[PDB]
RNA sequence: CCAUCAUUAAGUUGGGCACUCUAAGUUGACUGCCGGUGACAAACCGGAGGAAGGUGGGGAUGACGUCAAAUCAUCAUGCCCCUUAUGAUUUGGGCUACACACGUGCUACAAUGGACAAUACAAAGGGCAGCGAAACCGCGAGGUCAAGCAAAUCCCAUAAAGUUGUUCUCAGUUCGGAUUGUAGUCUGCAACUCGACUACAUGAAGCUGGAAUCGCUAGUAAUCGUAGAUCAGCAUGCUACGG
């Protein structure tokens, strides 16, 4: 719906908290952000086609959308081995020790 | 040479096959520009290879064998080295101290762990 | 505390990802090649007991 | 270390026809978190068992879609 | 590490092109594992742009640069202890400074992006006539020790 | 003494391989059937003292193969003790008929399994010098290649062993293809290890 | 494939594969045979530990490759070249046909 | 395993093309050896025969000696105690922990290349229903069960990367790829504990990461990995060695 334009659209949703792997994975190599857009890009039509995939439920920041919060009701389960986003600095159990170190 | 000529280096095998003629690219009939973009291990192996003249005296047609990718190639011109010497006598004063007439100069020398060569301490804990 | 805590799998043991296929005759329970059902070493010392031939190094 | 198998108790399966139907005892000799967890595991009691007792920990209705395998605290983490 | 001390380094080899190794180090700068794909061009999209922009090849213009970088002639000092004791002195081609190529003028790589297929090109022709630029080939090896008179 | 444990010492020209093996299935039973019972005659043949060690396996037509050459407790007469074997030895081998025998010939000249010949010559601890130890003057010269001697049995309740030395000479000393092997055995220290260390020289 | 009739290395492979030219030429047969080719050899894994002590290496050497030989062109009356009886029992003479 | 035999399927089959590649052991090797500034006080260098060079060069074992240093929670035990358990045993749990001070195996911000397929190749080492090829089952997993002959070959494999050429303009950009319903996909009552597929609904950072740390000078890293033994259903680890 707000994507960039005046140059390439495969940075719209790549690194986006919330959507992690539909991110670049389905909303970009599976669904269509355009890879060579110029400023004149048919931003007449190709435009608002491309604004289903900002429907669903909370998408990219944008928390009306496509995305984030139906693991709400999941989250009161007292439980372990989904931490690593559900609670995304992963504390499943896992080290953010001397040298367990590289992404989050 | 038709039979197993010395065509050997850095994991290859050769039946150089010495048909008289053409010699060429011989390595699978093929180019290196683009496909070695590096482009810079073939023809700079000159002074075995080309001094004598085996470009229209002899092909190598070599049979390969050994080497990841990065390993193998430019075994055509050991194949064309024991060539020369039945090929064309025409540099035979440069071969023995190094060309084709004895051996090759580099090759497969198998790792040694924990070492590189002759005095380093790259940075590892060291420098 | 003898002689046949070792002999799980001398016997029908149930769970062998403990690996309990070993050497011969030294210390080793778990995480080695697998002949004679107890040790480390046994997979060079018995295999030099006429199992298996011999050895060499010629002189760097 | 496998994805087989989705495995409700098979054994006490058998008895959570009447503890889920039902709810399930509060403190007693259980593990309360592998039998996975589905919004079928709604207002019912169990007892995480990691070695002074089994402490009562909920098996609610929002209980869904999360998984087990911290059953029990193996830290009890706090040390530095 | 004294009782044992030090002696000299190796060098580099040169290319069937033009017979030059002052391209060859240049591209040891760069010789990715044997795997010089485009290496190769990066070098001949950094190193061609003194004999590009200067109308002169490797041998005369280039030379402007490639005669001063390692060396003939040095700075260098002896078995003097703690002191100043400088002077000028002569060398070879052990430890190296000013003939062939070693230390300021020319940091083909040095613009405005994180690149190396043309960032090498951006940087590279400042030693057209020994005129410094950025660090990689010789200027601010001459220089060195000359200062103290009085209060010396 | 920070010293590890050799076994083989120069392969290639003088150390060899006796490897003649043919069981091939049952790698969990059938090598223990032949590897198992090496676990068995330390006792019996009575202060052995043998030359080395030479195991062959004939194909699985197995009869076993080793020697311990001191006469009478692998003999009999004519046939009595391998005879018997023959029927006892089914379960230590398939068959094992007239399990085998040879002569030893100074065996104290043997490198590897000498150190039985001397820790039955120091291990008793009374009269240990002359009843038992008189064969380290009798093994002494008959030039064998290893020269290397020590003792360490229970001499006081030592936890190392011993030599002699004295000094002068010249020589071309560099070899290369000679043999010898380890030494290491049971005695009871009580209170800080100690397994006897024990070679001699012919 | 890799000779070896019970002997590995050449002072005594020197023999086994010295007799391969020869005891492939013993009874019924016109067989294709002597074939030498590369070698093959086997590791020791071992270390000596039983909780922590281990890590140490030399220079190893091996050998023992039990054949393959193409011998399988036989002639039940013309004794020439498959079927003589060659060391079976002592030596382990696996040659495969 | 053709270079031409022809009946090039190259049934590499008739013979044996197949001297060679094939699959090439032996022994060529040993400055065995000349001229020297070598002054002899010599061999190595200069050479020069060697397939190999000056041991052609490496891949298990290391003294006179054993600190008995992890391990009586391995076995042959000195010794006891437990002899209705401290033996235990099962599975109920987890034992793969979870702020960790430390750590390591595998990572992107590239344009020698991010995805795509190929260029093609494999040494390896495996097998008794084998690999799973082959169709197969896939961008995601990869079963299906025979395949090949118990395997000189067979399967592995299109291996792959490197390279072709870009994708992008070197950003934080298909960069790049974990997470919960996932299938339980490969899967055995029992995985969701005690994997991941890159895949969908599920961001994890990052500007070449700082000084430092700590491996790599030749088929090894880079390029990436292919087989094998643990994996009673769990590998990235490990070992064999590859274009």
């Known amino acids: 719906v707000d994507i960039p334009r005046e140059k390439r659209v495969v940075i719209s949703l790549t690194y986006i908290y919330g959507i992690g792997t539909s991110t670049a994975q389905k909303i970009l190599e599976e669904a269509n952000v355009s890879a060579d857009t110029r400023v004149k890009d048919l931003t007449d039509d190709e435009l608002g086609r491309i604004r289903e995939v900002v429907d669903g439920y909370k998408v990219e920041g944008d928390l009306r959308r496509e995305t984030n919060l139906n693991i709400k009701r999941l989250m009161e389960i007292s439980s372990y081995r989904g931490i690593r986003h559900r609670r995304g600095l992963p504390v499943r159990g896992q080290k953010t020790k001397n040298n367990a170190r590289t992404r989050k | 040479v038709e039979y197993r000529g010395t065509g050997r280096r850095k994991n290859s095998v050769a039946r150089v096959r010495l048909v008289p003629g053409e010699g060429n690219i011989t390595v699978n009939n093929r180019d290196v520009r683009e496909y070695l973009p590096f482009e810079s291990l073939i023809l700079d192996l000159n002074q075995p290879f080309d001094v004598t003249e085996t470009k229209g005296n002899y092909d190598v047609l070599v049979n390969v064998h050994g080497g990841g990718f990065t390993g193998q190639a430019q075994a055509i011109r050991h194949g064309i080295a024991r060539a020369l010497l039945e090929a064309d006598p025409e540099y035979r004063g440069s071969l023995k101290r190094a060309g084709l007439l004895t051996r090759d100069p580099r090759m497969k020398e198998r790792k040694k762990p924990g070492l590189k060569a002759a005095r380093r301490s790259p940075q590892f804990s060291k420098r | ?60 | 270390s496998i994805k087989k198998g989705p495995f409700v108790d098979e054994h006490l399966m058998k008895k959570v026809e009447a503890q889920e139907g039902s709810e399930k005892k509060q403190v007693i000799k259980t593990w309360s978190r592998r039998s996975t967890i589905f919004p079928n595991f709604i207002g019912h009691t169990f007892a995480v068992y990691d070695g002074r007792k089994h402490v009562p920990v909920y098996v609610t209705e929002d209980m869904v879609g999360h998984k087990l395998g911290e059953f029990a605290p193996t830290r009890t983490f706090k040390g530095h | 590490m004294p009782r044992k001390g030090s002696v000299p380094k190796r060098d580099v080899l040169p290319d069937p092109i033009h017979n030059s190794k002052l391209v060859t180090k240049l591209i040891n700068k760069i010789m990715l594992d044997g795997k010089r794909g485009t290496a190769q061009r990066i070098l001949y999209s950094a190193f061609d742009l003194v004999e590009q922009r200067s109308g002169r090849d490797a041998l005369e213009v280039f030379e402007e640069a490639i005669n001063n970088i390692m060396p003939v002639l040095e700075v260098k000092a002896r078995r003097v202890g703690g002191s100043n004791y400088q002077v000028p002195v002569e060398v070879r081609p052990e430890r190296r400074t000013t003939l062939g190529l070693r230390w300021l003028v020319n940091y083909a790589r040095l613009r405005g992006e994180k690149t190396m297929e043309d960032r090498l090109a951006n940087e590279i022709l400042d030693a057209a006539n020994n005129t410094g630029g950025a660090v990689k080939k010789r200027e601010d090896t001459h220089k060195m020790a000359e200062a103290n008179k009085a209060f010396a | 003494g920070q010293k590890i444990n050799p076994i083989g010492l120069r392969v290639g020209i003088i150390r060899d391989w006796e490897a003649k093996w043919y069981a091939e299935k049952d790698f969990a039973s059938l090598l223990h059937e032949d590897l198992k019972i090496r676990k068995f005659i330390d006792n019996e043949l009575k202060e052995a003292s043998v030359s080395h060690v030479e195991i062959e396996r004939a194909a699985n037509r197995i009869n076993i193969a080793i020697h311990t050459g001191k006469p009478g407790m692998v003999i009999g007469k004519g046939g009595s003790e391998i005879e018997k074997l023959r029927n006892k030895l089914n379960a230590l081998t398939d068959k094992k008929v007239h399990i085998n025998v040879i002569e030893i010939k100074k065996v104290d000249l043997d490198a590897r399994l000498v150190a039985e010949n001397i820790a039955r010559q120091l291990e008793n601890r009374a009269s240990f010098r002359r009843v038992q130890k008189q064969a380290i003057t009798r093994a002494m010269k008959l030039g064998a290649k290893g020269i290397k001697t020590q003792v360490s049995g229970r001499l006081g309740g030592a936890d190392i062993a011993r030599a002699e030395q004295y000094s002068e000479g010249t020589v071309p000393l560099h070899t290369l293809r000679a043999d010898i092997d380890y030494a290491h055995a049971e005695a009871d220290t009580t209170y800080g290890k100690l397994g006897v260390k024990v070679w001699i020289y012919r | 494939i890799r000779i070896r009739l019970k002997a590995y290395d050449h002072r005594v492979i020197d023999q086994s594969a010295e007799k391969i030219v020869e005891t492939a030429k013993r009874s019924g047969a016109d067989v294709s045979g002597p074939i030498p080719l590369p070698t093959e050899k086997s590791v020791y894994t071992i270390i000596r530990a039983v909780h922590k002590y281990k890590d140490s290496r030399e220079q190893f050497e091996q050998r023992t490759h039990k054949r393959l030989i193409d011998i399988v062109n036989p002639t039940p009356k013309t004794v020439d070249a498959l079927m003589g009886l060659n060391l079976p029992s002592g030596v382990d003479i696996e040659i495969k046909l």
């Open chain 3, 1 to 60: 505390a003898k002689t046949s805590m070792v002999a799980k799998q001398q016997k029908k043991q149930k769970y062998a990802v403990r690996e309990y296929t070993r050497c011969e005759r030294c210390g080793r329970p778990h995480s080695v090649y697998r002949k004679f059902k107890l040790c480390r070493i046994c997979f060079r010392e018995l295999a030099y007991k006429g199992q298996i031939p011999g050895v060499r190094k010629a002189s760097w």
